[PDB]
């Protein structure tokens, strides 16, 4: 059956609106690339790192904008809101960028339209994570995720009562329940012949967390490699 | 039906059939209990429906890939009623302050708060634990698997049985199936860090116990 | 700290 309750349907629409408005789809986007450093892999290309660090700062700003529109998030303590965002930041950035992947040309497209190939992605800052992220993006395609599912999955990672240094974890748990429910029925309302899409989709979070964990370490190695410092917002977020 | 394809009854038997019945340092005790449960792990896998039907090479690969997470999950759930500690298969206990003194308090705390406590605060039963370990067992993403397709199928069978079991035994909790699956992230993360510790133990090819020098002179 | 973060959250 999989009927969509008005209460659930509204939640699903809030999340999708939140994702679309803070993260344009790959198709609804004019693209552009560059020429520099698209040849061979290198420890780090400054010109690219600069451009990439800017887009990251902006997408983090957007990530917060996305969070604030989520039901109940604003009603959390500031300390908890900040603890959640810092913990899920990479989870969401990776999940997002991985939905900007075009298989044929083997590229990732950022929000300004900038489209980088695997090599440039590596030279921009990803480095050791480049192959993990691209592999993950390839594991996503079979799921045929839309804006709503990509949104719910993001919110589910964000609203996680299983984060350390929280002061009201139980209330974060209650907030996540509807998100998990809305996802279950929505995922199956679209793929009624395959109910296994819900757990499979959910389990991709396990993999996401590991890549994200590697990400936190890459921030440390980059902070060593780069000339200047990390942009203030990056620093506040991952340090 | 869903349960007749991967019965939770069978899985419960596997879990119960492997359930067992402090001089040295904490770590050595953990290693002592770990070795013991490795002897039994294979017998547990065989008791898991449709596992023996897989290529012998794929069985090896699956066990090689998940032996750590599988065991950690077991003693974690076994340590539900224990306060700030864990109960080993050897019968010995390892208290929180003990782990810290041995220099593994950080990861031991993750196990207590993210595994043991979460299992207790939702009242995870042996059957649900058995299914989660079965899911961890049937890991399609394992490197070298000849047929990842059949493995994915077995896991998805466990998905259906577990979800059916939850709806059946916990009607008032619509999102219990998902709340259970969300324990796997922590288990996976904790499992990796655990392996980072025993890195030198894994990659070994010199001369331990300093028997190298003992001979270098005589 | 979180100066910037607080700004984004206070809106
Ligand atoms: C194998 C050699 C390192 O194995 C381990 C070492 C450690 C851990 C787990 C394991 C594993 C993989 C299994 C433990 C199984 C037990 C103890 C089962 C049981 O009793 O029924 C935890 C407790 C997570 C943290 C502390 C250290 C790093 C010492
Ligand atoms: C933050 C950051 C990292 C991760 C980058 C990611 C994953 C952000 C995605 C940007 C997007 C998705 C922008 C856009 O949409 O324009 C790494 C690990 C390199 C360490 C340096 C700082």
Author numbering:
A (entry chain B): 177 to 415
B (entry chain A): 230 to 250, 265 to 461
C (entry chain I): 1471 to 1481
Direct quotes from the study:
The atRA isomer binds exclusively to RARs whereas the 9-cis form of RA binds to both RARs and RXRs, (each of which exists as three isoforms α, β and γ). A general model of RAR/RXR-mediated transcription proposes that unliganded RAR/RXR heterodimers are bound to regulatory elements of their target genes and interact with transcriptional repressor complexes such as NCOR/SMRT/SIN3 to recruit histone deacetylases that lead to repression of target gene transcription. Binding of agonist ligand to the nuclear receptor, triggers a conformational change in the ligand binding domain (LBD) with the repositioning of the C-terminal helix H12 creating a binding surface that allow coactivator to bind. As such, RAR/RXR is a non-permissive heterodimer in which RAR agonists can autonomously activate transcription while full responses to rexinoids occur only in the presence of RAR agonist ligands.
We now report the crystal structure of the heterodimer formed by the ligand binding domains of the human RARα bound to an agonist (all-trans retinoic acid, atRA) and the mouse RXRα bound to a rexinoid antagonist, LG100754 that has been shown to be an antagonist for RXR homodimer and a selective heterodimer antagonist. The present structure adopts an asymmetric agonist/antagonist conformation. On the other side, the RXRα LBD bound to LG100754 adopts an antagonistic conformation with H12 pointing to the solvent and preventing the coactivator peptide from binding to RXR. The rexinoid antagonist LG100754 is buried in the LBP of RXRα formed by residues located on helices 3, 5, 7, 11 and the β-turn. The carboxylate group makes an anchoring salt bridge with Arg321 [hArg316] (H5) and hydrogen bond with amino group of Ala332 [hAla327] (LoopH5-H6) in the hydrophobic pocket, similarly as observed with the carboxylate of 9-cisRA in the RXRα complex. The propoxy group is pointing towards H11 and interacts with this helix through VDW contacts notably with Leu441 [hLeu436] which is repositioned. Indeed, the propoxy group of LG100754 induces a steric hindrance with Leu446 [hLeu441] in the LoopH11-H12 as observed in the RXR-oleic acid antagonist conformation, precluding H12 binding to the coactivator cleft.
